[PDB]
Ligand binder design. Structure first.
Ligand SMILES: Cc1ccncc1NC(=O)C[C@H](C)C(C)C
Ligand SMILES: Cc1ccncc1NC(=O)C[C@H](C)C(C)C
Lengths: 304, 304
């Protein structure tokens, strides 16, 4: 019992972190096999970041200009290429600590762990959700670029995110491992509109199930609702419209607890309409949306 | 920018996790050098846990009864001894992955990372505080015993906690690495009184400083207070009395932001007396007490 905002164990990802230096800019790189992946903005100076011409800036760079260090070892760079907003530096040594891994593009509403790094060194790990608007509310300072987001299925690391930018709003933006930004963002120092965000409804419901499993039950009521009725409330409160695909994914939680999904929806409706009345659910005074139904099941069963 | 409940990178601790089996009980052990540390209740059966006579139960066990597995390798146990509530199993092989480490007894109010494990396998990592009453509000299921709590100072892992028990209240209790329980707890299946808990005042103040550094400033007011006046409010609201030692530790945060500690105390006083008025501070709708002033400084500067 007990429910925590748990991150995946970061060990497998720590073994992949390197420092990449180009000119006077230093950030983090991900060394998998004989390739080091890092944000392409490692090639820019302050005078360039307003609107960098990345193709031109990269042409002034040679393999020997990318200094790659894995703590005590220097990696020999034998190739460089830009793919979207990432640089792929081919090195002459395959990382001995390369885990089994996949590069995956996650969907908005999904969660992952972030290993925050500075100068190739891991500083901490936290769990977060990809917002429906494709931003993440992380904890990143200057130098944290190149830090990655991931999920782990037993022995396989699915890398889903690489940090590139802090928007003027203090929210964060980044790419998948092919360098495609999540959301409308570009790697330029310009104010950029993040879409209207919504709360991840299926996640809040998943968390309400985690609350019931773990003893917090005060929010359960004598009511039920329909997807249509619930979706009118979700609309008023800027929540994602709930679909049958969301109800289906909550099936295991609904089955374990015996609380029908639409009955939990009626508890959620009442909390949106009345608030918490100064009470808490799993140590939180608001409706948490950073746990997917998969994360709830995994945490509640003891999956390693 | 951004502030998250960050855990230390778990890599160094993952390399130490083993599975310990005795009879039909399996839990986790910590393999450091040629010793494996685990909760002594690995030697009990269900018929014993009401009031185990641990000395007698251990006398029926020989080195060969403790099965220690580090994933694919079986460790050869050449000695066993009970120290307080932990067993120390001497193995014939020093762990090649042993980090530089210390065994430390933390104080109430301090924080640490927990690497939740099942059958010697890491499942997740989260940050938590040792409550002033010596319990922790973790996320532990049956099989998680032997999971450890720790802090990391660059290359050195200070192990402070080993999980032993879930109280009937769903809160958790454990020992330091010498097997001494934090708090009044005994390793028996009996209802046990956890002391009256309080909120860790210095931590809440540290978090209010993290909020100001990161943009959340709405709670700052035109007031100030004294330790005496603030302590009357802390009394009414079950907060730890603030001392000059706490004010002193907040010095770096007070210096960086230019907000005197007693001025932040007056903001805290107003939030205790008025609540949040449906607003949030760093994504939280309550006063967070799981960040020490050290954690705030480390996260806000980028320490690896
Ligand atoms: C300053 C900072 C703090 C946290 N995360 C990231 C950053 N860096 C940036 O946003 C600048 C970067 C070159 C983009 C314009 C592509
Ligand atoms: C069931 C469980 C779930 C989470 N954490 C721990 C546990 N185990 C116990 O509390 C039983 C143990 C033998 C104590 C009586 C010493």
């Amino acid at each position: 019992s007990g429910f925590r905002k748990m991150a995946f164990p970061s060990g497998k990802v720590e073994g992949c972190m390197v420092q990449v230096t180009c000119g006077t800019t230093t950030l983090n790189g991900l060394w998998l096999d004989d390739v080091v992946y890092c944000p392409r903005h490692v090639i820019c100076t302050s005078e360039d970041m307003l609107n960098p011409n990345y193709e031109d800036l990269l042409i002034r760079k040679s393999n020997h200009n990318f200094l790659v260090q894995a703590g005590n070892v220097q990696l020999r760079v034998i190739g460089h290429s830009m793919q979207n907003c990432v640089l792929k530096l081919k090195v002459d040594t395959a990382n001995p600590k390369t885990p089994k891994y996949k590069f995956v593009r996650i969907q908005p509403g999904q969660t992952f762990s972030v290993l925050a790094c500075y100068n190739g060194s891991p500083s901490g790990v936290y769990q977060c959700a990809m917002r429906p608007n494709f931003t993440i509310k992380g904890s990143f300072l200057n130098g944290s670029c190149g830090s990655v987001g991931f999920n782990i299925d037993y022995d396989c690391v699915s890398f889903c995110y690489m940090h590139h930018m802090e928007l003027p709003t203090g929210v964060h933006a980044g790419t998948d491992l092919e360098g495609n930004f999540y959301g409308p963002f570009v790697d330029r120092q310009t104010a950029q509109a993040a879409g209207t965000d919504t709360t991840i409804t299926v996640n809040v419901l998943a968390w309400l199930y985690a609350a019931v499993i773990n003893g917090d039950r005060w929010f359960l009521n004598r009511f039920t609702t329909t997807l249509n009725d619930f979706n009118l409330v979700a609309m008023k409160y800027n929540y994602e419209p709930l679909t049958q695909d969301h109800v289906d994914i909550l099936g295991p939680l609904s089955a374990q607890t015996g609380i029908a999904v639409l009955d939990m929806c009626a508890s959620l409706k009442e909390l949106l309409q009345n608030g918490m009345n100064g009470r808490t659910i799993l140590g939180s005074a608001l409706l948490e949306d950073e746990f997917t139904p998969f994360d709830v099941v995994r945490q509640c069963s003891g999956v390693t």
